[PDB]
C-alpha cells in the first residue's frame, strides 16, 4: 500500500511527487492570494513559472543552492500538508527535496533538449535551504517536543569560533604492509578496523589512523544574542550557540542582525573528559540551515567594508546575499524620484513621519545615513566618509526617538547609553566560554557598530574617561588596543550619533553655547553637526505639535512620505553606486567658507571657534548631499547646502558673535 518512514508520517513517493508538482506548477499569484493581496497581482511577474525559472538561472549560473519559502508551500494546495512535514521532519523532507531538485535539473535538460551535459548535473550535489518557516517564537518558549524541528530566530551575532574540522572520512594504514583504506562516518561513529583487510596480512591491531590523510569538513559555532519579537514578563536576553557547516562557515560576522532558520537540536554533554559518563540534562543548540542577512525594513551593510569578504563568499560558493537585489523597474522608479525638485525635503520628511517638524535635524540624519564617499590611498592611507552628529537640547524634543529610528534603520548599529557603558565594554574584552572554558576575545559596542551608526543616548552623563575612548573612533575610525590579550588596531567605521542635555537639564540663554553644551574642545571638534534643539513656546507651533501627537491616538493602529522599504533601497543604491568627487568650483566655495568663519571667529571660550575638522565636515556633508542626488560630482550648490546646514544646526543666525548668547523671542522661529 503506502510506505511510511518509522517515527514520521512522511512517505518518500508522495513527498517527491508533491514537491515535483509544486516545482513545475507554482506561480507567485498563489502566494499573493494566500497573503490576501489581490490588487497587488500583476501580469508579467506572477503568471510566469517561478521555480522553473529559478532552476533555469541556477543552471545558467552554475550554482547548487535553492532558497525555498515555506509560505509558498502553504500557497500551493497539494503541498499544504508538506509544509507541516517540512516543519516537523526537516531531516527526511529536505533530503527528499534535494533528490527532487536533482531530478528536476535532469528533466529540464532532457525534456527541452539543451546542450548542457548531464554529467555535470549528476556529479553535482543540489541542496535546498528552506526559510520563513513561521513565527519567531523565543527559544526559551520552546519545549522538548520541538527537538528536530525547523525554527526561525532573529538575533545579533556576538562572536564565532575558528573553523573546526569535523571528521567525515577516516584513513587507516597498516604498520607492516602499508595497506591504506578509508571508512565513512556513520552517525558520528567511525568503525576502526581491528584486523588488516588484506588476505596476505591479517595482523590484529595493525591499522593506525593517519590524521592528515583523512578528509574533514568545516564546522563553526556562532554565539547569537536573540532578540525575539515577544518577550515575557521579567525575561533577560540570553545567547544561543548555533552550528553552521560547510559553505555557511564564516558567512556571518560579529555584530550583524540576521535571521537564522534551522533545526532544533539537543545533545548530551560528557561530565568529565576522562570518562564517558554523560549528563542527563541535555544541551540545546540550533543546526543552521539558512541565513538571511537582508531586511527591507533597514539598510544594507556597506559594500566598501566587506569587499574581501564578498570575494571570499564568491570563492566559497556559499551564495548568501549581503545586499538586496535591485530589479529594473524599481531602479527606474529610483531614477524617477531622483529627478524630483523636492527630493531633499521629500527624503528628509519621509525619515520619521511620527516625529513632527525637526526638518533640519532630519536633513542631518539623512545626510549621515548617506555619508560621504570613502577614499582609500594607494600609498596606504584611508579617508572615511562617516558623519558624526550631536543633538544637544531641551528635554522632550523627540531626539531619543530619532536615535531609535536610526538604530532600527541601520544594518549593524548598536544603541547604548551614558553611565551604563564603560571603556572596556566599548572597545573589547576577554570572556570565559561556557563550552570550551577558554579565554575568548569579544567585541565592544564600537567594534560591533563598524559599518553602521553607533547611537549614544545621554552623552553628557558619560564619564570623561569613557568619552576619551571615542576620540580615535571619531577621528581615524579605528581603535588601537594594546592590552594583555589584544595588541592590534581594529577598524571601527561607526558614525557616532549622540544625544545630550545642558548642565541645568534645560537650555539657559544667559549662559553661552559652549558652557551649555559642556564638552571639551577636542571632543566637540570631532562632531560634524551639532544640533541645538530648542523648545520655544508658540501658539501655532504648540497647536500643530499637539494636533500631530494627538492624531496618533485616534485609531488603534497608526503630505506624502516614501515607504520605509523604498527609502532603504534608495539610500542603499546611492551609497553603493555613487562616489562623488570634488571639483574646483566646489573647492573655491569650501576654502572661502572656511576662511570666512575662521575670520569671523577672531571676535572675542564663550563661543565655538572654527576648526579644520569643520572644513572636513563641510567636505563630507557636501559629498553626502551630492551622493543623495545621484551625482558623481560635488558642485557649488552641495557645498552651499552643507555650509547652510552647519550654520543652521548650531543656530548661528540667532547667536550673537560677541557675547555668544542666544535670544529666544527675536531671531528664533518655531
Amino acid at each position: 500500500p503506502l510506505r511510511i518512514i518509522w517515527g514520521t508520517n512522511v512517505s518518500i513517493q508522495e513527498c517527491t511527487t508533491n514537491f515535483r508538482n509544486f516545482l513545475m506548477s507554482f506561480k507567485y499569484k498563489f502566494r499573493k492570494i494566500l497573503d490576501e493581496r489581490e490588487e497587488f497581482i500583476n501580469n508579467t511577474t506572477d503568471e510566469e513559472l517561478y521555480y522553473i525559472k529559478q532552476l533555469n538561472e541556477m543552471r545558467e549560473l552554475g550554482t547548487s543552492n535553492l532558497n525555498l519559502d515555506a509560505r509558498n508551500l502553504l500557497a500551493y494546495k497539494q503541498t499544504e500538508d508538506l509544509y507541516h512535514q517540512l516543519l516537523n521532519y526537516p531531516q527526511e523532507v529536505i533530503s527528499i527535496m534535494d533528490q527532487t531538485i536533482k531530478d528536476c535539473m535532469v528533466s529540464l535538460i532532457v525534456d527541452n533538449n539543451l546542450d548542457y551535459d548531464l554529467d555535470e548535473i549528476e556529479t553535482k550535489f543540489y541542496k535546498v535551504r528552506p526559510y520563513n518557516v513561521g513565527s519567531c517564537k523565543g527559544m526559551r518558549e520552546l519545549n522538548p517536543n520541538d527537538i528536530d524541528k525547523l525554527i526561525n530566530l532573529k538575533g545579533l551575532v556576538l562572536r564565532s569560533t575558528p573553523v573546526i574540522p569535523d571528521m567525515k572520512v577516516a584513513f587507516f594504514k597498516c604498520n607492516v604492509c602499508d595497506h591504506t583504506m578509508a571508512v565513512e562516518i556513520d552517525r558520528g561513529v567511525i568503525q576502526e578496523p581491528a584486523r588488516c583487510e588484506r588476505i596476505d596480512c591479517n595482523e590484529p591491531n595493525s591499522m593506525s589512523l593517519i590524521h592528515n590523510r583523512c578528509s574533514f569538513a568545516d564546522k563553526q559555532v556562532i554565539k547569537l544574542q536573540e532578540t525575539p519579537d515577544f518577550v515575557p514578563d521579567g525575561q533577560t536576553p540570553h545567547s544561543i550557540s548555533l552550528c553552521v557547516y560547510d559553505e555557511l562557515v564564516d558567512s556571518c560576522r560579529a555584530g550583524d542582525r540576521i535571521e537564522v532558520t534551522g533545526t532544533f537540536r539537543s545533545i548530551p554533554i560528557r561530565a568529565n573528559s576522562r570518562q564517558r559518563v554523560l549528563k542527563s540534562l541535555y544541551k540545546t543548540y540550533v543546526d543552521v540551515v539558512h541565513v538571511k542577512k537582508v531586511s527591507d525594513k533597514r539598510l544594507d551593510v556597506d559594500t566598501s567594508t566587506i569587499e574581501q569578504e564578498l570575494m571570499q563568499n564568491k570563492v566559497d560558493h556559499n551564495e548568501v546575499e549581503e545586499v538586496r537585489q535591485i530589479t529594473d523597474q524599481d531602479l527606474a522608479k529610483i531614477r524617477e524620484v531622483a529627478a524630483r525638485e523636492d527630493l531633499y525635503s521629500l527624503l528628509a520628511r519621509s525619515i520619521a513621519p511620527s516625529i513632527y517638524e525637526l526638518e533640519d535635524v532630519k536633513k542631518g540624519i539623512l545626510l549621515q545615513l548617506f555619508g560621504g564617499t570613502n577614499k582609500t590611498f594607494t600609498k596606504g592611507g584611508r579617508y572615511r566618509g562617516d558623519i558624526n552628529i550631536l543633538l544637544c537640547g531641551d528635554p522632550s524634543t523627540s531626539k531619543s526617538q530619532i536615535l531609535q529610528y536610526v538604530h532600527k534603520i541601520t544594518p549593524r548599529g548598536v544603541y547604548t547609553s551614558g553611565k551604563g557603558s564603560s571603556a572596556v565594554g566599548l572597545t573589547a574584552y576577554i570572556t570565559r566560554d561556557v563550552d570550551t572554558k577558554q579565554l575568548v576575545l569579544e567585541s565592544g559596542a564600537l567594534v560591533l557598530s563598524d559599518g553602521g551608526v553607533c547611537c549614544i543616548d545621554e552623552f553628557d552623563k558619560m564619564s570623561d574617561s569613557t568619552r576619551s575612548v571615542l576620540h580615535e573612533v571619531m577621528e581615524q575610525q579605528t581603535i588601537s588596543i594594546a592590552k594583555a590579550g589584544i595588541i592590534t588596531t581594529l577598524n571601527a567605521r561607526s558614525s557616532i550619533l549622540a544625544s545630550a542635555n545642558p548642565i541645568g537639564s534645560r537650555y539657559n540663554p544667559n549662559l553661552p553655547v559652549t558652557e551649555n553644551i559642556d564638552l571639551p574642545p577636542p571632543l566637540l571638534s570631532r562632531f560634524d553637526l551639532v544640533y541645538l534643539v530648542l523648545d520655544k513656546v508658540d501658539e501655532k507651533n504648540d497647536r500643530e505639535l499637539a494636533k500631530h501627537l494627538t492624531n496618533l491616538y485616534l485609531e488603534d493602529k497608526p503630505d506624502d512620505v516614501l515607504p520605509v522599504e523604498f527609502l532603504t533601497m534608495y539610500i542603499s543604491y546611492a551609497k553603493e553606486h555613487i562616489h562623488p568627487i570634488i571639483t574646483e568650483a566646489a573647492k573655491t566655495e569650501l576654502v572661502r567658507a572656511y576662511v570666512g568663519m575662521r575670520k569671523m571667529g577672531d571676535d572675542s571660550e564663550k563661543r565655538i571657534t572654527a576648526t579644520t575638522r569643520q572644513l572636513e565636515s563641510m567636505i563630507r556633508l557636501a559629498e553626502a548631499h551630492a551622493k543623495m542626488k545621484l551625482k558623481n560630482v560635488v558642485e557649488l550648490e552641495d557645498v552651499q547646502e552643507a555650509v547652510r546646514l552647519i550654520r543652521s544646526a548650531i543656530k548661528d543666525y540667532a547667536t550673537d558673535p560677541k557675547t555668544g548668547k542666544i535670544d529666544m523671542n527675536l531671531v528664533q522661529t518655531g
Binding site: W6, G7, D81, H84, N88, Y89, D148, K149
Partner: protein, 91 residues
C-alpha cells in the same frame, strides 16, 4: 451509601510517588478511543505514540496468528482463546 471504602486521600498524602504510577496505570487501563482522526497537523509525539500502539497491535496479531497456525494440540473455545491470549501476551 454505607459501603466500605479505604482512605485513599491519606494514602495519596503519604505515598504520592507510588500513587502517581498507580493512577497512570488505572487511566491507561480504561482509555477512550480518539474520536478525531490523526492528521498532518498533529504533534510528532502523537504520531510516534500512535505508530507504537499500532505496532503493538500488529505484534499481538502476528503472534496470535503464528501460534494458531502451529496448532499444537489440534483440540472449549473460550479456554483456548484465553490461554492463547496469555501465551501471546507473555511471549
Amino acid at each position: 451509601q454505607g459501603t466500605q471504602a479505604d482512605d485513599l486521600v491519606s494514602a495519596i498524602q503519604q505515598n504520592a510517588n507510588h500513587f502517581t504510577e498507580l493512577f497512570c496505570r488505572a487511566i491507561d487501563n480504561n482509555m477512550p478511543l480518539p474520536t478525531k482522526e490523526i492528521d498532518y497537523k498533529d504533534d510528532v509525539l502523537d504520531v510516534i505514540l500512535n505508530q507504537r500502539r499500532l505496532r503493538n497491535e500488529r505484534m499481538l496479531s502476528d503472534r496470535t496468528n503464528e501460534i494458531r497456525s502451529e496448532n499444537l494440540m489440534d483440540t472449549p473455545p473460550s479456554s483456548m482463546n484465553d490461554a492463547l491470549r496469555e501465551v501471546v501476551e507473555d511471549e
